[PDB]
Amino acid sequence: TKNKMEAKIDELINNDPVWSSQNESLISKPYNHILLKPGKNFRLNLIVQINRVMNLPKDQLAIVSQIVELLHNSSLLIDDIEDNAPLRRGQTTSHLIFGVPSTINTANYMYFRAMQLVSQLTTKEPLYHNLITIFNEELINLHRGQGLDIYWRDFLPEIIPTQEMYLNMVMNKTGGLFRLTLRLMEALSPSSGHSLVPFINLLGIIYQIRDDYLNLKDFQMSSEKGFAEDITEGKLSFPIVHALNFTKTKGQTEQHNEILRILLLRTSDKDIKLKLIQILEFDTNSLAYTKNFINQLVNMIKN
Amino acid sequence: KNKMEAKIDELINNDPVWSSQNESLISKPYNHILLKPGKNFRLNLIVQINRVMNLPKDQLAIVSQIVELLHNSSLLIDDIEDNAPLRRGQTTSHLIFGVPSTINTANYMYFRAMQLVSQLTTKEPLYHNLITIFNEELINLHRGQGLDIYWRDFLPEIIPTQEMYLNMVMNKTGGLFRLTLRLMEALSPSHSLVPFINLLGIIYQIRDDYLNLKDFQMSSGFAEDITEGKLSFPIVHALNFTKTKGQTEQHNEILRILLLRTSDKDIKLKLIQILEFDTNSLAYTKNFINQLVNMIKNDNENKYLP
Numbered sequence: 047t048k049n050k051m052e053a054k055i056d057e058l059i060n061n062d063p064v065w066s067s068q069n070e071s072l073i074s075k076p077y078n079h080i081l082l083k084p085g086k087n088f089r090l091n092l093i094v095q096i097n098r099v100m101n102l103p104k105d106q107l108a109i110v111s112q113i114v115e116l117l118h119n120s121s122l123l124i125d126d127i128e129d130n131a132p133l134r135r136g137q138t139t140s141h142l143i144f145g146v147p148s149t150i151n152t153a154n155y156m157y158f159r160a161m162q163l164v165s166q167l168t169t170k171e172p173l174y175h176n177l178i179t180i181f182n183e184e185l186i187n188l189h190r191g192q193g194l195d196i197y198w199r200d201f202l203p204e205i206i207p208t209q210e211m212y213l214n215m216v217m218n219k220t221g222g223l224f225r226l227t228l229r230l231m232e233a234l235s236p237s238s239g240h241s242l243v244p245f246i247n248l249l250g251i252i253y254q255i256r257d258d259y260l261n262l263k264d265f266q267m268s269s270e271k272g273f274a275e276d277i278t279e280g281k282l283s284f285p286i287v288h289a290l291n292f293t294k295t296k297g298q299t300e301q302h303n304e305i306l307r308i309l310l311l312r313t314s315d316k317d318i319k320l321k322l323i324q325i326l327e328f329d330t331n332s333l334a335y336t337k338n339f340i341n342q343l344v345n346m347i348k349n
Numbered sequence: 350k351n352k353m354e355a356k357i358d359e360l361i362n363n364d365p366v367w368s369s370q371n372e373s374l375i376s377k378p379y380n381h382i383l384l385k386p387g388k389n390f391r392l393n394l395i396v397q398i399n400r401v402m403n404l405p406k407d408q409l410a411i412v413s414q415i416v417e418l419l420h421n422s423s424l425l426i427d428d429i430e431d432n433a434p435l436r437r438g439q440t441t442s443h444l445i446f447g448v449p450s451t452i453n454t455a456n457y458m459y460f461r462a463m464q465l466v467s468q469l470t471t472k473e474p475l476y477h478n479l480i481t482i483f484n485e486e487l488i489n490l491h492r493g494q495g496l497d498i499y500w501r502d503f504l505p506e507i508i509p510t511q512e513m514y515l516n517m518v519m520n521k522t523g524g525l526f527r528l529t530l531r532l533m534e535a536l537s538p539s540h541s542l543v544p545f546i547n548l549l550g551i552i553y554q555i556r557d558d559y560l561n562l563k564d565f566q567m568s569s570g571f572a573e574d575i576t577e578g579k580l581s582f583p584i585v586h587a588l589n590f591t592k593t594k595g596q597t598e599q600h601n602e603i604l605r606i607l608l609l610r611t612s613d614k615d616i617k618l619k620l621i622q623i624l625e626f627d628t629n630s631l632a633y634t635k636n637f638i639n640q641l642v643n644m645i646k647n648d649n650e651n652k653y654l655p
């Protein structure tokens with residue numbers, strides 16, 4: 047009724063928005079699905095290990111953990127949409143089950159739920175301001191890194207990145223969550239000089255180049271060891287970046303172009319992928335180059 | 350191994366490298382939607398509201414920028430989520446730069462927006478209030494958008510009621526109206542205008558749902574909401590009306606057309622004719638909007654406005 051309706055609207059607009067625990071469950075489906083995947087012990091082991099120097103009390107360490115786990119899982123949900131990945135940790139990808147729209151919305155929602163947890167880290171406004179800025183800064187870096195990686199891949203051959211460009215993209219893309227985890231911890235430390243940022247930056251780069259490497263190496267050694275999905279994706283991986291620049295430099299026009307063509311196919315044909323990998327093995331010698339580059343990186347730490 | 354060790358050492362000891370060219374690459378999907386008019390009515394509302402807030406112009410520019418970023422980014426994401434081919438008569442960004450880049454750019458702008466919040470003030474208490482406001486309304490916006498998408502993609506599992514729909518809108522459409530307002534109120538150097546902005550938000554969304562069908566009916570507007578299978582205000586009224594009146598076949602027929610995700614003009618017209626001739630849903634929505642607007646017009650004791 048013109049009265050009851052106005053009264054109902056009046057009561058609706060004078061209250062916070064209504065949100066039930068049922069509503070919360072319904073929209074958390076994409077996120078709950080990715081949680082079932084393993085790998086959480088080591089990222090927690092990373093946090094733990096790192097704490098053996100930061101000395102954070104345990105309730106605080108646990109909040110950092112929650113923050114990082116949400117950001118990380120949300121990134122994976124989105125990354126998989128962005129890469130059109132059919133699988134994640136041996137399971138069907140969330141966007142294929144619940145659809146791209148819900149998966150995108152849920153992942154972004156969790157970015158903000160993570161943000162909200164930052165206030166549970168302190169009651170001291172000065173520290174709080176610093177933690178948010180860190181949060182803000184590394185998420186900004188994560189997106190800058192991912193944005194370049196995606197652009198190079200989706201607009202290939204518009205830009206053939208050099209090894210230097212690739213490494214700057216990784217510092218942003220992969221170093222983002224590594225630095226975010228460490229920087230939050232270093233701002234919380236009750237310690238008493240320098241940070242482990244440079245170290246974490248190097249760990250990030252070794253992590254990413256090794257990942258790029260094994261994606262091809264595992265497939266080359268065994269078709270049932272991996273799928274070499276980085277090729278299907280058309281990714282400008284470390285070994286690919288070396289092959290594309292080597293070929294251009296040595297004047298191997300045909301090879302340079304065949305590398306691009308296979309990347310642009312977004313193919314899942316195993317033989318075509320194995321051909322590209324053997325091109326990197328025997329012609330550009332990108333695999334050995336990458337293997338050696340990883341080792342040198344690793345020696346920079348162990349030495 | 351030292352020239353290589355040297356360059357890595359230089360890399361890991363510096364802030365990550367990011368140039369203005371890199372910034373340009375990444376902004377392309379956002380810039381594309383900028384060629385979209387309307388920015389003035391959104392800034393108008395900002396300027397008009399500022400007559401009660403009176404923020405110093407310099408602070409008003411930053412709020413306005415935070416607002417533009419969030420609104421444009423949310424539209425880029427909205428278009429991917431609805432698989433929309435057009436936005437303001439122009440091809441949507443994701444069809445041009447692809448879905449991957451558009452999502453990433455839109456998300457990047459949410460964070461650029463967030464960074465601008467820290468420049469509204471250096472006062473530590475207030476800053477936190479501003480972040481909290483920001484955080485809370487984005488959360489609401491996603492909850493609402495999440496629920497809207499869920500009802501659409503799971504139909505016919507859940508048919509919302511008018512009440513459920515109104516709560517979804519308070520979260521979805523009210524989020525950014527309230528974010529804008531609440532920020533301005535928190536910064537004001539001078540009763541809350543939040544109730545008024547919520548109503549404005551509800552009016553804006555119902556009217557949006559209404560016009561999407563009316564513009565098509567009065568002239569083949571494409572009625573994309575039908576193609577999208579959206580639980581719009583008229584559709585929600587038609588579904589619950591036929592269910593209550595026990596009109597089983599009309600109920601099912603509306604569900605069937607929505608589930609078709611059809612671009613067929615004749616089929617879309619058939620659904621509209623059900624709404625006009627069977628449920629009288631469009632006339633019901635027209636009336637419902639008028640009533641909401643009257644709540645503002647007949648606000649003599651100024652309960653809602655200042």
Ligand SMILES: O=P(O)(O)C(O)(C[n+]1cccc(-c2cccc(-c3ccccc3)c2)c1)P(=O)(O)O
Pocket residue numbers: 089092114118121125129219220223224227253254257
């Ligand atoms: O093969 P994908 O697409 O699953 C990929 O690993 C996704 N990805 C993107 C950004 C960061 C990470 C990542 C990898 C390892 C550890 C972290 C991490 C996350 C949080 C805290 C510490 C470390 C992030 C992975 P990639 O970086 O695009 O190769």
Ligand SMILES: O=P(O)(O)C(O)(C[n+]1cccc(-c2cccc(-c3ccccc3)c2)c1)P(=O)(O)O
Pocket residue numbers: 391416420423424427431521522525526529554557
């Ligand atoms: O027709 P669509 O799909 O572009 C749609 O308007 C998208 N949408 C979602 C959320 C908010 C808004 C919106 C519309 C107009 C103005 C604003 C706004 C946002 C911030 C500050 C002032 C105004 C938000 C639009 P809808 O809500 O999904 O119907």
Ligand SMILES: [Mg+2]
Pocket residue numbers: 125129
């Ligand atoms: Mg990836």
